[PDB]
Write a protein that binds this ligand. Sequence first.
Ligand SMILES: CC(C)C[C@@H](C(=O)N[C@H](C(=O)O)c1ccccc1)[C@H](O)C(=O)NO
Ligand SMILES: CC(C)C[C@@H](C(=O)N[C@H](C(=O)O)c1ccccc1)[C@H](O)C(=O)NO
Ligand SMILES: [Zn+2]
Ligand SMILES: [Zn+2]
Ligand SMILES: [Zn+2]
Ligand SMILES: [Zn+2]
Ligand SMILES: [Zn+2]
Ligand SMILES: [Zn+2]
Lengths: 51, 511, 509, 516
Amino acid sequence: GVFGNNEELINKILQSSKTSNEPVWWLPIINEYRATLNSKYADINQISSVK
Amino acid sequence: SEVPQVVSLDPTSIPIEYNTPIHDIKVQVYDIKGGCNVEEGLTIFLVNNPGKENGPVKISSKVNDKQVSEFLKDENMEKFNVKLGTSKHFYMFNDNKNSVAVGYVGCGSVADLSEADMKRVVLSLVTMLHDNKLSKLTVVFEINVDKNLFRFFLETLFYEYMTDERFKSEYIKHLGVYINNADTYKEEVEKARVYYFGTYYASQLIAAPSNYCNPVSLSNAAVELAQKLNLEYKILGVKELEELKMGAYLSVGKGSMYPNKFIHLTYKSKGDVKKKIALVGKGITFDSGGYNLKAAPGSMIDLMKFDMSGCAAVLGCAYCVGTLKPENVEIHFLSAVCENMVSKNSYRPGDIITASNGKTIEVGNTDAEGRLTLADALVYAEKLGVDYIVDIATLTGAMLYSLGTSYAGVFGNNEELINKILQSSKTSNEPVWWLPIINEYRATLNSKYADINQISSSVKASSIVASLFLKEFVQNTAWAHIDIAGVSWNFKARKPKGFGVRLLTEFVLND
Amino acid sequence: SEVPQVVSLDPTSIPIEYNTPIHDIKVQVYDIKGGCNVEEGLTIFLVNNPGKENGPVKISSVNDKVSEFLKDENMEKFNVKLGTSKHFYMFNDNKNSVAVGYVGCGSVADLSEADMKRVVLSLVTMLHDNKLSKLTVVFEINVDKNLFRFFLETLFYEYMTDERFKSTEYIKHLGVYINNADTYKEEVEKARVYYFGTYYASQLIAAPSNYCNPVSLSNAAVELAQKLNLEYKILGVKELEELKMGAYLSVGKGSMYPNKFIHLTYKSKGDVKKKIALVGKGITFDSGGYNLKAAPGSMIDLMKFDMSGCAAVLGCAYCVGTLKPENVEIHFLSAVCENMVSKNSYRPGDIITASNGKTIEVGNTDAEGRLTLADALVYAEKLGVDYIVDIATLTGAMLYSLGTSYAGVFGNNEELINKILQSSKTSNEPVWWLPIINEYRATLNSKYADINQISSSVKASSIVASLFLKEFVQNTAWAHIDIAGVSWNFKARKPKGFGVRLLTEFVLN
Amino acid sequence: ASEVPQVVSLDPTSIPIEYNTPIHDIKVQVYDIKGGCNVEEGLTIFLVNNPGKENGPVKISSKVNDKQVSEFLKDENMEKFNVKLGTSKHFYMFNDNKNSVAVGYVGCGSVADLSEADMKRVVLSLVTMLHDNKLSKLTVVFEINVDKNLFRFFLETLFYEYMTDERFKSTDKNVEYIKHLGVYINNADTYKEEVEKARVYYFGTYYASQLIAAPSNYCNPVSLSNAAVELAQKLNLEYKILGVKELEELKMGAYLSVGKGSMYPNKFIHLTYKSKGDVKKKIALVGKGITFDSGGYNLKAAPGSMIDLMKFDMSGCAAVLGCAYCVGTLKPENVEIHFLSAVCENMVSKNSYRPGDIITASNGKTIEVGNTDAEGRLTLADALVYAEKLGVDYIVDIATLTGAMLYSLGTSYAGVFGNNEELINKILQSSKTSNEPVWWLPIINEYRATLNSKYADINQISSVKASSIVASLFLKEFVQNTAWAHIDIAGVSWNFKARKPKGFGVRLLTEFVLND
Ligand SMILES: CC(C)C[C@@H](C(=O)N[C@H](C(=O)O)c1ccccc1)[C@H](O)C(=O)NO
Ligand SMILES: CC(C)C[C@@H](C(=O)N[C@H](C(=O)O)c1ccccc1)[C@H](O)C(=O)NO
Ligand SMILES: [Zn+2]
Ligand SMILES: [Zn+2]
Ligand SMILES: [Zn+2]
Ligand SMILES: [Zn+2]
Ligand SMILES: [Zn+2]
Ligand SMILES: [Zn+2]
């Protein structure tokens, strides 16, 4: 699986995947799940409590 | 058909609300460039603050009321911030000594609002309404929304505002909207109200417990829906299902006290037909798992009336299509409805059953019941001679591990159809992500004795494997499969989402 | 009334022993001051020793010169460790062979509920391996009038052996030497009655579920009512439909046995200054339903025990019907059914309607007891009674809370709680008061129904369940006795018949 | 003051503590309702109910010394709103001086006597009005009846929830605490004494909360004992911290074994308060101080285990130090109090103690370990032996001991066990006046036999699921002839929904020390 913050880079990853013949699939970074990392005390949680 | 009972106190029909209080709301849209009137009711400003995170609230719209303008001055509003979803509202008297409420909902610091961002904004509004007895709500959009997102706003507002009290023992009458380019958005209002009910209608079917919503009662409700819309309808019973040789579907329901019922609605255009579309929905009114009983920690068996969400999504689409009445199109709404139960009459792990296309199938897990019924529905669908077959189903719990509770996955054998669905996901704002059918896993379905395995032994990646199974029952037609298992139920709100209704409708309307 | 069968070899009734060898035992009680004589059988001295580790035994009295065996020098070789025992056989003055011995009662002077039980098991052990015709017991320790009765009751119960289901002896006389004997004599026949009431309950609980089903159990209740002389009424499905008991009826939907609501009634010849309803959970087998008991620890092979509340209720009916109390009206209630897996069963998620109109969302088909108890409490309150006491094996959490010795009681009225606690003291069946915390009520707020059956969370399972039941009592003092932890004796692999003596002491006081 | 060991230099060497909180900067003024209410600057809130009528209409019943604000609050206008418990509404209006003021209410239901949970629900609603609003002044008007204790409880709880812990934030923080608090109530002069008593109890509670919320890399045996020393110094309390060598001398084999696997040396905390008066009662308070409970070789690996929460296993100690603050501040008369905690960390190592190991307590009793995750009773055992040698009238210990508390009493009520009815009844009474709910649970002697070890004097655990009772039976064996009580707060210490500690026990223990 490939995740990213930039479509140009991701597609380059996909393009390299095609020519290297090492298969990779694009998966989404879903911002709605970001709130599950809101820690009560630290700046951020390491993990969710959203499987 | 007569719904069988064990005792006389067992319900014989699903209660359905057709006339909702939402249908009583007169909606008016005004242009923002002209300023706001704040006479009656509750007035809410949707405000953001670009580049300053949790920044101060600043209203920037002239209001034709001196008492409310003093309230909305910057010195007073800077006492609030725009953190997404945050809200404040005050009750006060305006210039003519009438009681009004004014407030805001924070829309963050990001110009571009998402499908999720808009949902949290809407919930904040809804929280104020569930505490409000007033007759009018006015919403002022000091943010950017396209025509689609504005419709999504109304749909979501409508959906959340409505409360289901069928099993229990002061709604607004007017909705005002100030938005830029108002006249372009007016056409979205009544389209939203339709999309609203289709989703809520599906919601009612899903939320209905399995003693209320069973194969017979759901098929009866489908007929009743068809009669109110005027759609051709046909319910296939066991005897006909036996002569169509639908052994996979029929096996699944053997252990139920309720006869199998196959739902077939049809919309036909008065036009000439340039597209035939079949929509297929998973219709398991309760998934106990059968002899593969759902007893493992996490199985969520208390939630398993929801396993007919796909079917509900299809009926929800049927309402919208039957109401909006698109042209040049013929739509078949299909669902092989049954109940997956434990009994002496139940089918067993290891049983080899024969689908209606002649393929023999070895059952390895009776809780993989959905793909077995869908198999027969897909064979039924393709013989209809359609251009597109789209199935939607709460098929695999694995989706929770892959895409989660917000995005559904779409699989298919045809890239154009997949692309059309993604486009439909993008204009309906019901998020879908394209997932692969990896052909290399196909060998894991090779049975030693039967034509094909029902499940793999091996290859965790069950969502793909389930799609590989389904692909075997569509021979020569463009087909797509949407797993809504992760997204169907709203776990936080303890209610259904009615997911898929708007997605499928946008697919038939914009194609 | 006819028990349905799958095959002809299936039992159509519960076998019941009414006339036990215990009812055949001659009991007489003497004052220790007159001395003891050791004619026939086995004579046992109950002795303690304040300042023991445990310390040596010392006897004190015997009108037969054998006084010498029990001399201080020989007896000092044995110790008084609670439960320790030794008995020796000898020839007496009349050249007859007699057996003499001791049971150690520790050093704590006033013996408790548990400790006295340990004494009895030790006594019973000697009786089970010996062919005695008479047993004589000497109390060289001090006990209450109530604890003595408890001694007798427990003795009788542990001594009795259930052989109903076997394919492949008892003493006829019991002697007791104690001081102020004339004060204890009234306790003897009361004990034998409490014995059978307890043993009767034990018989019902121990009866396997193929023998003890909703029909066969309701039949036994009628037979009990008939011999006793108690007014009886048995509700079948058609009158339960009437009455709209949807919660109770859903639980039994998956069973091959029709639901039967048991209603026995006792009315005093006195004038009635108290009307009491006793309600018992009567699940003849708890499979758990679609929430099948498949998890480790569920003990599904024991779930015939899930009608212990019902059994306790009928056992109480025996004592009440026999002892015939004054100024009391008692209703013996149990909504009996079976929780099974079937095409006809109720499902997780189902919304059902109780007889008071409240809609209930089922979250776990294994939370079946509170569903049946809900309708029973509505029915109970409709009789227009002053006190409602329900007793049920409701929650396994009780094992984590109080364990296997003390039962928990919950309630809405402190006086009723006070009477139950007082009854626990004189009945010597240990009970502890637990709180109904209203702060947890919100966990039952359903999205669709009037109320949730269970919490989704809130591991305070016993308290949440008590909260559930309380919603079905509007204006009556009600207490709830949870015997899920105390009903079964795991070590001895038999029932305790817990609650029979507790409930009876409650109506008597 | 000892040196906190580090594995890397980035390891924290002290627990951050906020002593001077924005709450302490708040000027609190109390007025009598009979003089009327002035509707100021800031936000003015009415606490209203409607006795015997459920979700009934709102009616203000206190003279407002403003014609414009009286007119707005006339009930013609107010009955469109209801008093449903937790409900709240905001009002905007202009007063007699043509100034803009804010007014509102919080519904207090229909039950007249508000329980502690109800009042919390009232307070939580108040805090929502305080959050996201930049008020400079908050005014509360009591149109409901509360006794002196419940009024104090109102303040304590208000302060607690209003306060936000930002010690461990760096790149996350945003907007502003009120500086003034006005209270309108009838018979105000009787309630004035509760104000500063609340401010103290609040912080003792928040102080305990801060220690518990502190993660185990911050809050360890050394850093926690350091914080206790530092606290004693600010309060002029006598302190002594026992290290490994003294604990060895004192032969505390049970306590010392538990800490063998930790990189942090064991630290025993002993604070003391003595009145200049003559001492007429001596009390020992013992708190469980496991800075992290991994479970040891009985590792917490089962699904319900809550291993990320186990920094909270020193809540008992935290309540005790929190009590020390309150006592050290209020300075009670004729009393001598010992604040004790055997602090350590239960870890997995080559040096860890093993399941099956037999250890010797300071009173000579040999103990067979059956489960290393039952480490708390081992530390309390030596702490209780230490406590009794001090020659006190009462020994009260408080601990997150058994998860069974969640199955028995839940998350709201703590359990108390004991060997003396008069002590149990003083603790229960303290629960009433502190409004920290506690319920009396039994120590069942029939269960003592399962602690009968084949080789050691006694087993650490049974092999009988009544864990809280068995643990109490264990502890009872380490108090010979002194009145003793055990408070199991395992279920009530952490607020799961809020995702924070409660600081449970501070007010209960403090009230217990004060009312004799
Ligand atoms: C299903 C209900 C919760 C009742 C159930 C019960 O308590 N089940 C649980 C289990 O043993 O798995 C459990 C035990 C202790 C603590 C928490 C949960 C009881 O056995 C019953 O079926 N009564 O009808
Ligand atoms: C097991 C111990 C004797 C005490 C321990 C405990 O009670 N654990 C729970 C229990 O026994 O109910 C639990 C165990 C496994 C899985 C889930 C929950 C407590 O957490 C602790 O370690 N205190 O120090
Ligand atoms: Zn399934
Ligand atoms: Zn399914
Ligand atoms: Zn059950
Ligand atoms: Zn049960
Ligand atoms: Zn532990
Ligand atoms: Zn611990």
